[PDB]
Structures are given as C-alpha cells and as structure tokens.
Ligand binder design. Structure first.
Ligand SMILES: Nc1nc2c(ncn2[C@H]2C[C@H](O)[C@@H](COP(=O)(O)NP(=O)(O)OP(=O)(O)O)O2)c(=O)[nH]1
Ligand SMILES: Nc1nc2c(ncn2[C@H]2C[C@H](O)[C@@H](COP(=O)(O)NP(=O)(O)OP(=O)(O)O)O2)c(=O)[nH]1
Ligand SMILES: Nc1nc2c(ncn2[C@H]2C[C@H](O)[C@@H](COP(=O)(O)NP(=O)(O)OP(=O)(O)O)O2)c(=O)[nH]1
Ligand SMILES: Nc1nc2c(ncn2[C@H]2C[C@H](O)[C@@H](COP(=O)(O)NP(=O)(O)OP(=O)(O)O)O2)c(=O)[nH]1
Ligand SMILES: [Fe+3]
Ligand SMILES: [Fe+3]
Ligand SMILES: [Fe+3]
Ligand SMILES: [Fe+3]
Lengths: 479, 480, 481, 480
C-alpha cells in the first residue's frame, strides 16, 4: 500500500514505496537541517521551514502535473515508469543544497573557491548517485519496473539539464517530461510553484499565483518537431504575473537588505572558520567546509549545524568566526547605507565586484567629514534581478494554444498582451553597507555613498536628499 | 458597543451612532446589491453584497484614523473626527445601483446620456435622505457631533468638494489628511480599495497580494506644501506600485472578465427595454422609472438587484422583450465573444466614438468567402480603460514619503529611483468584440470581420488570430 | 471539452457537459436566489452565500469520493456511468429548498400546512423530474452512456432514500450499495453534503472548520458488511469522526441555531403566513398557487425564491400590510426580545404536539414577585430545538464500519468505550428559547420573571443568567442551591 | 520609535525598545534553535517552527489582552508600566525549554535525574534572571519607567506562580487579573494557549477551531471573592468548553501522535546514553552534562536541538550507542507500535508504577504458547494523561462569567446549565505499547502479549484487537 504524509501546503500527499525508500536515507533526511531561506529566518521569524518539506512538495507537484497530462492526453503514452521517475527527480532536485541554501552556492563557494564553477544542482546529481549506491536503491527501482541504466540518467537530466536531441534518458517524443521539475526553456516549473506557496505561508506574505489552475489549462503540443508543454492563450496574463510574483518575493524577502547582510556575515564567518573545521569523508579523508562538495559522504554531514558548531565552540582557532556569529546574536550588524541602480545600459561585470568598496572610499565628497573611511570598511552587494533568463522575456519562450484549435501551438508577443507590462526584464541593485556602526562613521559613509552614486551616474538614492542634503544638488541630472 | 463578525476583518466594534445609521432602510438596502454585479454569473463565490463591504470600509477608516492618532497626538484628532471618518466609510457606497457598477457605468450612461451621474453623487444624496428620514441629527449631537459642519465633512469625504485655495468647508487645512482615508482624490490610496481587495479575493477564489495592515503601521502625517497629508515610508514604495498592480490584475481576471462584462451588457440591455414600463413609487407618490429613480431617494431606496427577478418573473406583455434577454442568461445563450484587441502607438479611442464601432466592424471587407453577411446591430464592441486610477498618470508620483532618519520631512520618489521593471505606461485600452448571433456559421463570419477590422485600423493581432482567421492574418505585413 | 469553474472552497472544478446542461436551466439557476443559511445572513453578515454554489460543491465532492474509491479498488467496477450519476445526484440534491432554505421546510410549511409531511429532499426529487422533462435532458443522458429508466431512479434514490427485510433500492444492486452512502448517507450521516457546507459555511460565517474531508477520502475503502458492500473508514479515523459530529453540533450552537438568527427566521415565517393568502404564483397551465401550495407544482415553485421577502417588503397592497410591517420591523431592528434559554432534566422529552401549548404555560406561571405589567400567552414565543448527532438519540459512530492496516478487507466495529471517556454521554438534547413580543423595559422585566418561574415550575435547568435577571425567583428552588 | 516584525500568525507586531533589547540576547535567540513540537517534526513535516516565534506571539497577545482590558475599563488603572511587564513575561515565558521542548522536561530529565522536581517554567525564571544580569537590562528597564525590584518579581511571578492571604509580592490584589494573562493558574485560559493553537495548526496542517480575538472582545474584569479577576461573557461558555476540546483534540492528533512519541522516547534514550560523555562549558569554565546544564544557565544557553546533530555527526566511540539510535531514526527503523488501551472503572495508573509495566506485558501468559519469547526490556509502555488542564476537574467550574444586563456582577455556570453533550469526565489515560524488536516474528508475539495483558488487567479492547490477536479476544467475556 501507499504512505500518506501531511504537508500544510499541499495536503495529504501519497508516497509510493520507492519514494519512501529514497526519503528514509541520511542523504535525503539531511535536508531537514537546511533552511529554505537561509539567513531570511533572521528577518522573517516565520521562515523556519527547511528543504526537506520543499523537496516533498516538488516531488508531489511533479506527480500532479505529469499524471494530469497523462489523463488529458493518452496519446502521449506516459507510463507509470515515467511518472515515478519524474516524482523521484522532483523529490531529489534540491538534494545538493549547502548550509543556508543559496548562501552556500551563491556567496560562500564563489569566495572560498573562485576556481570552481559549482551549483546546488550539480551537487544534487552527485548526492543522488551517492544516495542510490550507499542505500541499495537500484534493486528496489527494478522491483517497481524501472530500468536503472536509462532512468537514473533521466532523473539526473531532469535536475541539471544535459550531461540534435541532447538527452540520453528519454527520446524527443517525451521532451515534455524535462519541462516539469526544472524547465530550461522558460523557467515555468513545479520547483517555483511549491516555493511560492510554501515561502509565502511561512514568510507571512500572500501568494498571488494559482498553480492548480495552470495545470488545468496545460497541454502537450508539437513545436519544432518536439512535443512540449503549452499553456492556454488566456493564461498569458497569469504567466507574466507568475514572474512578477517571483520578482516581488525577491524584493520583499529573499533579497531583503538585512537578510543579505546576515548572509554575508555568516559567509564571512564560514570563510574564517574554513581552515580549522574538519569533516570526515570517504575512506576517512579530511575535508573542509569549502571542499566537502567534492566528496558526498562528507557533504552528507554538512548542514546548518555548522553555524551552531562555530557559535558554541571554545577552540581559539575559531575565535574570529565565533565573534562574527556572536555579533549577529547581539544584533550588531553592519549598517545599511543605501541602495542604487545603474543607468543607461551599464551592466556591472562580476569580475569588478571585488573593486567596488575601493571606489566608494575613493570618492571625494565636497563636505567636511569627521572621519575618513578606508575601503575595508565598506561592503558593496550587487544583485541581479531578472525574470529568470537574464535580459530575455521568458514569455517569448512559451508556447500557447486556443480553445478552437487545441493541438496547434502559437506564440504571443508582449504587445499582444498589455502596454502595462515591464519594459526591461533585468536590472541590477547595488546595496552599500558600512562595517563601522557609530553615529560619526555612518554620517561619513552616507556622504561617500551618495557621492559615489553621482560620480558613476547611478540613480539617486530614494532617501538621498535626507542622508546627504549637501551632495544631491551637485548633480544636474537629479533636479 | 455592538460587536459584529465579518469574515474578512474579524470582530468589528460598532459605535451606537453607527448602529443607528446601519439599522435604516437606506443602508439595509445594500444587503440586496451584489458587489461584483454580473461577476457572480462567472465566479460563483461572488455572492457578497455592498452591505458588508460598507461595514468593512467603515471599520478600516476607523483603524487608519485611530492609528494616526495614537502615533501622532500633535494632530489633535478628536473622537468627533474619528466618528465622522467612520460614518463616511460606512456610507461611502450608499448610492450604488442594481448590480453596482453596471448601473453607473453602463446603464445610466445609455439610458440618460444628458446626465453626468456617479455612485458617489448618489451616496451623498442617499446619506442626506437617511439622516432626515430617520432623525439621526439628534443622535449625532448626543455623541458630540455638530451636524452643520460634520454632515458637510462626511459628504466631502465621499464625493470630494461640493463646489487652488482650500476647497473644503467641512474641515480646515490642518486636518486635510482626514480626506485621504475613505476616498483619496490625490493618489487613490484609500481604505475602499483595501477592503474590496481582501473581500473580493476571499469570495472570488483569488489570493490578494496586498498587506493593508502593514501600510498602516508605516503611515504618518507630514507637512507637504503648507498642508498636512498622509505619507508612507520610503521602503513601502515598492508595495505601493504592487497595490495598483494587484488592482489592475483583479480587473483583468475578474471585474472585466469577458463573460462577466457580456452578462452586464445583457442585463443593462434588458433594463433599457424594461425602463418605460416599470414604475417605482417615490416621494409624495410621484412615479419614477428605473433610469429616473436616481433623482429621488425615496424611490431609489426600493431599487435593488430585485429588479432583475421582477422582470424575470413578470407576465406583463410589455416586458416580454426584457424578460427574453434575462431568460437567455438563465439558459446560458449569451452573446458570443469573438476576441480582444488593443490600439497601437498612442492612438486613444474617444468615448464619443464608442457608438460607431459596431458599424466599422461590419464595414470591414475581409478577403475570405463568407456563408453569412452580418449587419452592425449584430456586433457589440466594449471598450475598457485599464489604468492606475489617474488616467495616464503614475499615482506614485502623487504620494509623499518619509525616511527613518527624518520622519517629519516629506519627500518624493520617482519611478527611476525604484525599478526598471515597472510599467512604461499607466493606462491602456482593451477592445472586446462580441456577436449577438450565436450559431456556428455567424461566429465564423464575425471572427473574419473582427480580425480584418483589427488589420484595417492597425490594432494588435488578436492572441488567437492565426487560429480563428488563418486566411486573414498573413494579409498584414506588420504581423509577420 | 470540460468546463472549468472557480469555487473559492474547492478550487477549479471540472464540469462534465451533461452537468453543464443540467446546471444551465431555470430549475437549477433558481438556487442562485436562495440563501444557504436563510435568516443567518441577518446575524452573520458574511453569510451571503446561496444554494447554487453549495450544490456545485456537493456535486464536486461526490465525484471526488466515488472516483477515489474507483482508483483505489478496481474490483468494485465503478463505471463512468456510475460516476456521472453520483455527480448528478450531488449536484441536484438540494434542488427543492424553499425561500430561506431550512426556514421553509422546518418552520413555515409545518405551520402553514400541518396536514402534509414534506421535506426539502422530496422537493428535490420532484424538481429534478421537472428539470429533466422541461429541458430535454433524457436525450443528452443517453448520448453520454446513461440509461434514463434505471439511472433517474438511482439519482432520486441517492437524494431521498428508497422511493417506498430485502434490498430496498431499484436503481442499483446490492454490490453497489456504497454508492448510496456518498451524497446522503442514511446509515450514519457521513456524507459529502456535510463536508461541503462545513467548509463553505465556515468560510462565509467567519468561523474556522476543524474537519478534514480530504483526509477521510484518503482512508476510505469499501468492504463487505452483512452481505453488502459499504464504505469503511480506517480504525485511526474514529476520533476524527466523533469530531466531525462535534463540529456539526458546534456550528449549530454558534451559527445555525443562533438565538437572533432563529427569531429572525420565526419573524420571516410569521410574515409569510400573513402574506400567504394574498400572494399568487403562476404555475402549470396558468393555475394560481400560494406560497404554501407552490410545493405541489414545480413550475410554480421554480419562481418561489428569497425574492418573496422583498416582494412583500416593497408592496403597497393593503392586504399585505400585516406581513410588510413584520419585515419592516426587521429592517429597523425591532426584533422580538430574547428572554433566555433552558433545558429539560432527567429524561423528559418535550413532544412536538405540545409546542403550541408552551406560551400558555409561561404566562400561566405565578411568580412570587410584584409585577407592573401582566402578559398574555400571545406575547410569548417558545422555540424548541432538538440538537443531536444526526440520528436522534443514537451514536452514529456505532453505525460506522472500520478497517485495520493489518487486514484492510476485514470490516470491524469500534464502540465508544474503546475510544475515549471524554466523549459525550448522550447524543441528543433539547433547547428551549423563550422570547417576548413586547420590546419595552417594563414588559421585558416581567417576561424574565414569568420565564425563570416557569423553569422552576417544570424542573428545568437554571438559566445561565438566572440569578441576575430574576434574583427574587432563583432562591425559591431548592434544587438550584 | 517602535520596531515592527512580521509573524505569519499575528501579522505585523510592534516591539517596544525594551523588548527588542531583551530579544537581542543569546539567552532569547537560543529559542531559534529549539523546535516547538520536538519530535513531531518527524511526523508532521510542516512543524519546523521554533520557540522563538511562539515566544514573540505570546508576548504580542499578552499586550493585546492587557491593553484591551485597559481601554474597555479605565477604572482598573492599568499603567504603561503594567503593560510592558505583562509583555515581557509573555515574551520570556518559555525561555527555559530544553532541547526538543517538552521531551526534555517531560521525558528526559525525569529519567536522567529522578531526584529533582524541575519544569520548563522554573528554567524560564532562572534563564530570565541570567538574561537580565548578563546583558545590563536593569538600567534600560529604569529608563522606560520600570522598577526592577518590584517588576522583575512580577514578571517571574507571571511565569511560575508565587515565588513563596494574597500570595504575590509583585502586584497588589487590585491587579490580580494581570496574573491571569500569560499563565492562568486558576483555570488555564491564557494567551500561551491562544498562540500555540493558532501557530501549531498553521504549521501542522490542521485547522484551529478557537477564536481568541472574539474572547478578548467579551473579556472583562469583575470582583470575585474580594479579588479583581478576568471574566468571560455568559454566552461564551460554549466556546470555552470548545477551547479545551480543541486542546485535547490537538494532543490526540498531533502532540501525542503514536510515532511522534516513539521518536521522542528514542531521542530521549539516545540522550541518556550520550549523557555521561558530553561536556558543556558553563560559568567559570565548569563542566556540565546534558542532564546537569539545568543547574547553570550559562551552560544551558548552549544546550539546544543542536545536541541531536552533535551526537549524530560524532565519531567518539563513547557515543556509539547513542549515535546508533539516532541513525536508526534516519533510516526509519523505529520501535514498532503494538497498540493502545485504556483503564476501566476508575483505575488510575500511578506514576510510581510506570517503570514496572514492561515487566507486566512480558509476564502475560497468552494461551497460544509462543515460538519466540520476549523479555521485559523489549517492551516500551508509554502512559499518557489526557485532561482539560486541571487533572480530574472541569476548568469551566473555575471560570467567572458576566451578563449583558449586569456587567460588573460575576456569576458561575455549571455543566448542567450548558449541555448534556459535554464530557462526563475531564481526564483519562492512554497506554501505548511498543516493541523494540522490529521483525515479523517478534511483532506477532508482542501483539499476543499485549492483547493478553489488556485482558489480564481488565483494560479496554484494542480497536484492532480481533485482527491482531484473534485467538485471545474471545477469552474475555466482557469484550463480547
Ligand atoms: N490533518 C490531520 N493530519 C493527521 C492526523 N493524524 C495524523 N496526521 C498527519 C501526520 C502525518 O503527516 C500523516 C500521517 O499520520 P497518520 O495518519 O497517523 N499515519 P501513520 O503512519 O501514523 O499510521 P499508520 O501506519 O497507522 O497508517 O498525517 C489527523 O488527525 N489530522
Ligand atoms: N466566530 C464566532 N462568531 C460568532 C459566534 N457567535 C456569534 N457570532 C457572531 C454573529 C455576529 O456577527 C456577532 C455577534 O453575535 P453574538 O456575539 O452572539 N451577539 P448577540 O447580539 O446575539 O448577543 P448579545 O445581544 O447577547 O450581546 O458574532 C461564535 O461563537 N463565534
Ligand atoms: N483564480 C482565477 N480564476 C479565474 C481567472 N480567470 C477566470 N477565473 C475563473 C472564473 C470562472 O469560474 C473560471 C473560468 O474562467 P475563464 O478561465 O476565463 N473561462 P471561460 O469559460 O470564460 O473561458 P473559455 O470558454 O474561453 O475557456 O475561472 C484567473 O485568472 N484566476
Ligand atoms: N509583508 C511584508 N513583510 C515585509 C516586507 N519587508 C519586510 N517585511 C517583514 C520582515 C520583518 O519581519 C518586518 C520588518 O522588515 P522591514 O519592514 O524591511 N524593516 P527593517 O528594520 O529592515 O527596516 P528599517 O530598520 O529601515 O525600519 O517586515 C514586505 O514588503 N512585506
Ligand atoms: Fe527547489
Ligand atoms: Fe466602496
Ligand atoms: Fe445540501
Ligand atoms: Fe508557551
């Protein structure tokens, strides 16, 4: 029989025995100890939720969508084998997230090991392999009609994309299965649908996107010699609103100015603790926090725990790291100075991020300062907000259908929908903080910042006339 | 105090004066007017009526004014001011007609083109009638109000000024912020909106993305141009753009739903046909029609959604034309939706031209063999202005903000200071075409006329255009 | 294709073309103009919701449960024909409700026409027949694989029970008895009508619902019980099932039997009785029917809705002046005043026959207190209310079959003692509410004295507020100290 | 100014600067790392929520109730000092919970240190003292008008009851009602309950049937036996019985879930085995064990749910026994549930006898002479007392009520005055038996021992009893 489990977002989920068997392993249960929104918990006290339950929900929704397409269109010949594989992918899709989720792959690893190009997804594939092998799942897969050679490839391919038709796991006549868990074409996937619903529930924000409705009007059609998922013509509006909702959650919560500074402070403490923390891996080899990603037996033991390990330690080697985390407890965080954006079409390249604190201190504001501030006193956090496809409109990469001809796929441009939609689909936000907390240094920091904005032809800080009233009239373009 | 349980706002407390206003025919009337008119016939959850919206707006008006008072005693907001703001909120939609916006938005403009009449003007008149016919003036005095000054203040909250120095007679400039609570003429950020977002969502089955409670926590009165106004905190600017997005989104999904609108036009049509033969007893026994009941409030008190069922259940042969339209709604033989389109460039369609557009669609000569020719009376063309509440203007350019560092110093925040992902324009037009002939052959023809008419006037390609009229869409160079 | 419709309780419901065809008729759309909770709207301003949308939801849930049983147990051979019939029943199950729902079949018709035994359900069967015939549905049923002879009986049987020991149903055999337990469960009362209105009424009332129907469906299963295939719940759900009936009783206490909701219902009923004689409703062949007699002809009853309230209120006919004055008194909020509530003791049931006589008894009490005003029996209203777990004095859980994880085809019983000592001792009781038609301060004082005395006289329970409202009368009774 | 914080249950809470200052300390932030429902997370995957946010909410609701009583009844002379103190108590009320909340004070400490009588509350008082002293809060309290001598006593008294006629030193008899807000010793109706109902439901995926906001609207202080207490309105008596029903229902479904409890016993077991070899640095560097950290608050500050993962991730061979239990939880090789039963008549099982019950189950001689024999160490018998918070008493008999007609006159309402459908008793016991041997053969045996043991002690028939032990159930005359 089936196992039932009660998620507060999705209700009573049914779990196939194979899924239960995958779930009840150290590699998966690990996700109970990794928070979804990392440092966001330290701003939204509701956001205690962990990857474990996100992972169940993505598994659940993956099943819903593939099973729905099957009932509506038997011609597709979606097998119970295909359904199980899609569920397993959904279930295991975030297996490779590190401590504090996106803080790890987004802030820490890029600083700790700049040579590597590593992502949460690559980790998931590796950790999935480790889960299968270390728990004897392959026999159980066979028992329930799967073919490990073909299907383990298919599952991995659903997660990271491909390791003519680039996939070895399934033929072109089932390409639509690759658009369920992680949609490379346009980004409309069930990972999104779950975390919108889930993050909102815990954050204390209401979610404006109806995934259930999208499933009712979803359908597979032929597009360029390939069978893809298509939405109904009328849903085009709701799809633009899906990406709006996403961007809106990033603005309010995920990229919250203090959430991000807590993430940078935790990252900083990890960098300082890196050298002196050992994690036992395969064959007893010792791995560091930054190197545990190379061996999955070590990475299985690397969770949010590492924060409290550092905090509670008495090792004097970890004193520098422990002091940063103690400063978070007491709430002596680095102070937020302000936010700004580039103008024209000036993109700030990732290569230049290291240099920006130097530039802020280098500004010469025509105002008498109490204190001079060095470049090490500033932090400059650059954030790319987009609709998931850098500068592109993802709706231009969605296929639609009409009531009158439901097998005939079509495109819908932006002009066909509304003039009130966004003009661009990507931008950059630049947040500046100051490590010196006191009244005198904060005043100075504000002057350096608002000047630096004028110097580089950036947008006027929203509060700019208040924080630096002597600097804002200097720029002709701001009047 | 009386407590009452609204499913949106919880247990509301009602002041005795409010209870006394509520328990009158003029107010209880609102129990029999649906919030979303014809929308009930598309969203079966939307059974909710104006009565309960009216209570909630009254409630939120109290919340906001009471909150400003606690946070800023310097404003000297009196318990008299609070009561007046509550009364305005409570009575703000008193003048809605049968099926709410269908009445002031479709019916009255067709039935009586000479008049410029709104739900709000009706509210002021109906408020006056409520006060006089129920002896409220003594009760207002009993609770510290001054009817001369305050009844003006209440009416002014609802419709704006009753006639660039200070236009209000009800309160001085040092209390201008009170006029921004119930119906905000400056920018549109008011508690009417906050209630109906929450309420309509609850009943529609859509989730609401706007947190009014949060906005209240970061609201504050500051001096702006020699006048005390409500200001939001700098950080809320994003949430305010999202407020108007939420609004526009509710209009797109629900309020301007293609079938909701066609049901509204069909009910309006049946009212126009029934107008002449329905009498409503007014003041001194005078007889008023549906279209003329707005002139006398004793008559208008008896004009509700009932009028639909009165027509439907009637046996008078004079009402047969009207009754047949309403019977066609029951059976679901609605006028068929052909498609939607928009103008291009910045070519605005003037209101004067709306009458002429069915003629233009029939006048199109599509290069396709048609089974049926269709006359202009067979088409309906519904033009809809979607905006952020201030025609072509960005309402956030008319909001004052404040910073944590200087909370009495008001500032402005432009669009460029916030995000490049915000809208370029703040108004547009949608043109929906329907066909009165329902059959398979006429609908095909209608689609050809429509998609041609779109090409003829350099409008946008209908989303489904390549499917419904595949022989017409390649004709236009601009659509390839 | 399917039609999709967005209910705020259940989400996006799919409607089969046959159902759409049934929905889009005057007989069904009528339900848009009948409120679910009748006079409750005048106490809970959220409760604007109408039968129409309840009806859609019951149709939806009926589909969910039958479709779920089918997937989990193919051996049952549940056909797409069976599924459609169960949906149609669910959809049409409340078709026969009158103006203000339960006020009509529960208060008005019993007073207006005491000779008749009539219910909302009997009306539904009749109105279903009328819907089918007047809209040519029978051809459409055949088109989608139904057999009108057999299936229209099956649908009617789902609604009212048997149209009349052996197997009592003609619509389906004993090997599909479980289908009769979905829409209206005669065995124990666990049905999808309940599940929808809990969720729906709560949503609109502003009360939260403590019952998870989705969960019950996941652990539902058909087993053999006494040579008959019935729905069974899992052993562990027994607690949640007792809580289902608790939730029901709790909704009745808070909302449905609210003291003022009920007085508004009696006042509207009263106004209908006074308007009855002078309101004509055109029926079949032009014949004239009254409000009380429209139940006899469905073409008339199709036009009888909540409208009738506003028809009376807005009228100028002097024949309707008595009725119109009652409804105007509701607008102004001059309602009959609530005096208090009480219960019988021991095991003294008050028979329905005696309800007429109780106002006489209250006025007949001789309270040992100086009164300014004497009150006659016509001044009092006494409303008697039977609260139960749906099966008069019986525990409905004693009529539920259960199954275990270890043996899922073997049905069992679970007694009350096996579950908890904190469950109810009895499963039915009576509440007696007394109101006074005279509103003034002096008459209300008097009414309270008559009432609290009458309670002592008949060995009823002490009113909760009794020591306050009648402090000179409560020490008189030895049993209350 | 005020700090705003967004809790998903209560909305945007305002935090007074003094509260912020208390919140931002190691002793308080500690609560971020303790789960509300301990091992329940391993059954309800929604239940990730921690004490931190419960603590904020209780602080919030404490403010709501005291501030509401103040507005409705100025005669009480509730000061802004009183309000702050009530908030601080609410905020700090669960400061002393251990790893996995109630598992610690309810299972672990009673086994690890049977000599001691220790509770989460006693810990809170001690941890509150430590918080104040180690963070220099006393100056800040004074700055905002508090008097540390009197008020720190008042706060502690709100949490644990009297620290030693009128038993309280923190406030006089004319403010006794303040002691009924955070932790109500009289009847149990407090805001701790109100928060966790709402919160646990939100995260569990169960809906909550209790309206705390409504209760506040109809709450009021009256004189009762020469003392000013909180009273509810007469009509709320039903909703109050339903409050305790809701509580009992949450215990049945979630908190005392058969597997949640077995995971709690397994974690407790692993803690007992790890106790001796885990050192936690305390005050002056002294070494404390898990069981002894309760004696020194500097040590206890570092004792959180972490300790689970510390054991799990360790390589010390001294911790191998403990680490193996926790690894068995990961793999889901939990001790197997055999069944549940209750006593009959009025046979209470005394706490003294709990140790002996596994012996009794193995000692049963079922007449199906068994192919594997099981020893007493193979069985776990978990006894659970379900009540309405006051052992065998009806807590509604300890609530004072008032009537609309005389709102200062307090009264009592008995059970008979309300309903015959209420509970007969207000306490009972549940006995769950599990078996440590997991295999098919031992589980069969365990079931026979159990169902016999039930017959032997005249307990209730297990629900599944006829299925699991069909040879044993006809033996007992009383079960047919
Ligand atoms: N909504 C709700 N969820 C519940 C309830 N009880 C448990 N859950 C949640 C907790 C879990 O998330 C899920 C399963 O709990 P079980 O139904 O008790 N199933 P298990 O494996 O214990 O027993 P078996 O092997 O006997 O089937 O439902 C309840 O009454 N209500
Ligand atoms: N959530 C909830 N709302 C309720 C409940 N009971 C009533 N309401 C709703 C219905 C209404 O919206 C509101 C008032 O109903 P009452 O508090 O019962 N007040 P009334 O005027 O009858 O009592 P009096 O004159 O004796 O003061 O509460 C309940 O138990 N729960
Ligand atoms: N949640 C939600 N409900 C919606 C939305 N739009 C409509 N509804 C609700 C209202 C209705 O209950 C239902 C159907 O609305 P349509 O999807 O517009 N379908 P119709 O028959 O008009 O179009 P066709 O024949 O072209 O498919 O969904 C929306 O964006 N969101
Ligand atoms: N619903 C909602 N909650 C939000 C939002 N933004 C933050 N929160 C939540 C997160 C927090 O729980 C709370 C406050 O976050 P901030 O209002 O951003 N205040 P902070 O102290 O950063 O700014 P300052 O010191 O300048 O006043 O609201 C939002 O847009 N919406
Ligand atoms: Fe994910
Ligand atoms: Fe309004
Ligand atoms: Fe029903
Ligand atoms: Fe607590």
């Amino acid at each position: 029989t089936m196992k039932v489990i009660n998620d507060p977002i999705h209700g009573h989920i049914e779990l196939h025995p194979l899924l239960v068997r995958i779930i009840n392993t150290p590699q998966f249960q690990r996700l109970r100890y990794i928070k979804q929104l990392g440092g966001g918990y330290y701003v939204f006290p509701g956001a205690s939720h962990n990857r474990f339950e996100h992972s169940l929900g993505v598994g659940y929704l993956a099943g819903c969508l593939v099973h729905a397409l099957g009932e509506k269109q038997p011609e597709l010949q979606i097998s119970e084998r295909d359904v199980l594989c899609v569920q397993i992918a959904g279930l295991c899709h975030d297996l490779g997230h590190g401590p504090f989720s996106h803080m790890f792959d987004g802030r820490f690893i890029p600083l700790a090991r700049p040579e590597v190009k590593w992502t949460h997804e690559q980790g998931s594939v590796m950790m999935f392999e480790h889960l299968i092998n270390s728990n004897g799942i392959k026999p159980v897969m066979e028992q329930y009609g799967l073919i490990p050679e073909e299907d383990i490839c298919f599952i991995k391919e659903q997660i990271v994309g491909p390791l003519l038709w680039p996939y070895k796991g399934r033929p072109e006549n089932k390409s639509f299965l690759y658009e369920i868990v992680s949609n490379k074409r346009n980004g409309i996937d069930v990972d999104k649908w779950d975390y919108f619903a889930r993050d909102c529930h815990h954050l204390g924000i209401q979610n404006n996107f109806d995934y259930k409705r999208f499933i009712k009007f979803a359908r597979v059609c032929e597009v360029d010699n390939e069978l893809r998922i298509c939405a109904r013509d009328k849903e085009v509006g709701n799809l633009y609103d899906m990406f709006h909702t996403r961007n809106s959650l990033h603005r309010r919560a995920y990229q919250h100015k203090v959430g991000n500074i807590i993430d940078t402070m935790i990252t900083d403490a990890f960098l300082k603790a890196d050298d002196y923390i050992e994690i036992t891996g395969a064959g007893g080899k010792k791995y560091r926090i930054s190197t545990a990603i190379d061996d999955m037996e070590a990475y299985t033991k690397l969770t949010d725990n590492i924060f409290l390990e550092i905090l509670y330690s008495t090792d004097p080697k970890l004193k520098d790291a422990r002091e940063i985390l103690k400063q978070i407890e007491y709430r002596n965080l680095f102070k937020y100075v302000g936010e700004t954006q580039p103008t024209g079409q000036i993109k700030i390249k990732r290569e230049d991020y290291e240099s920006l604190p130097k530039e802020v201190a280098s500004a010469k504001p025509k105002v008498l300062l109490d204190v001079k501030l060095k470049a090490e006193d500033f932090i400059v956090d650059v954030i790319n907000m987009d609709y998931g496809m850098q500068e592109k409109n993802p709706i231009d990469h969605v296929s639609f259908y009409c009531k009158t001809a439901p097998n005939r796929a079509i495109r819908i441009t932006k002009n066909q929908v509304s003039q009130l939609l966004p003009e661009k689909f990507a931008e950059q936000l630049i947040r500046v903080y100051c490590k010196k907390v006191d009244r005198k240094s904060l005043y100075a920091a504000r002057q350096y910042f608002v000047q630096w904005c004028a110097d580089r032809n950036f947008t006027k800080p929203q509060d700019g006339d208040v924080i630096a009233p002597l600097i804002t009239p200097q720029k002709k373009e701001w009047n």
